[PDB]
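Sharing a chain and its predicted structure for anyone who wants a worked example. Both blocks are below, sequence first, tokens second.
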Amino acid sequence: CRPLWTACG
């Protein structure tokens, strides 16, 4: 992940 990058969600 990598914060609220939108990916991790």
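Comments welcome. The radius of gyration is 4 Å.
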